[PDB]
Structure 1
Amino acid sequence: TIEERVKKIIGEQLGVKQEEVTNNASFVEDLGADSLDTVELVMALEEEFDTEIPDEEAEKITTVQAAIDYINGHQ
């Protein structure tokens, strides 16, 4: 419901239970994601929130909180 839909997206994408998707968790080092999963993760967030995340911003979205912060700061 809230902007914490980011958590649900990370869960479905990386196949991780919503209980393990913590704010301080990083996709690669904490949720077993590779560089192919993260490309899909950024695109998934792009489709969910009707936003365009350019390359220089997508490179900074490596943790769950970073993803919540970018979406909250872009309507």
Structure 2
Amino acid sequence: AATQEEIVAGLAEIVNEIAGIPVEDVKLDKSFTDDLDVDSLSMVEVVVAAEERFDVKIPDDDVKNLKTVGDATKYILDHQA
């Protein structure tokens, strides 16, 4: 279980590990594979550590359709426990 504050703010922690993007820069209007740029191939590893964080369940086949954390937020909320 998590909140938007865990998703948005929390992702930046994970994103800072995976790639090294600022711990507040992974905002709702910040697209992972566009504005953020998070290694690009390793992006699934962000998912893994995010799944670790929110306890979310998002397989590679599922995550392949995301964009920003705006999408990720309501998405992760429905895909988490």
Query: Match of 2:10?
Result: 9
Moved over 6 A (4+): none
Gaps of 5+ in 2: none
> C-alpha deviations, 1:17-71, integer Å up to 9, x for none?
41x3321211121113222341121112211122321222111223111111112
Cα RMSD (Å): 2.0
Give the TM-score taking structure 2 as reference length.
0.69
Q: 3-state DSSP class of the match of 1:36?
A: coil
Q: Per the alignment, in what secondary structure is the counterpart of residue 5 of structure 1?
A: helix
TM-score normalized by structure 1? Answer: 0.73
- How far apart, in 2, do the equivalents of 1:51 and 1:17 lie? 20
Unaligned 5+ segments in structure 1 are none
Q: 1:48 corresponds to which residue?
A: 53
Could you tell me how far apart the structure 2 residues matched to 1:50 and 1:70 are? 13
Q: How many percent of aligned residue pairs carry the same amino acid?
A: 37
Tell me the matched-pair count. 73
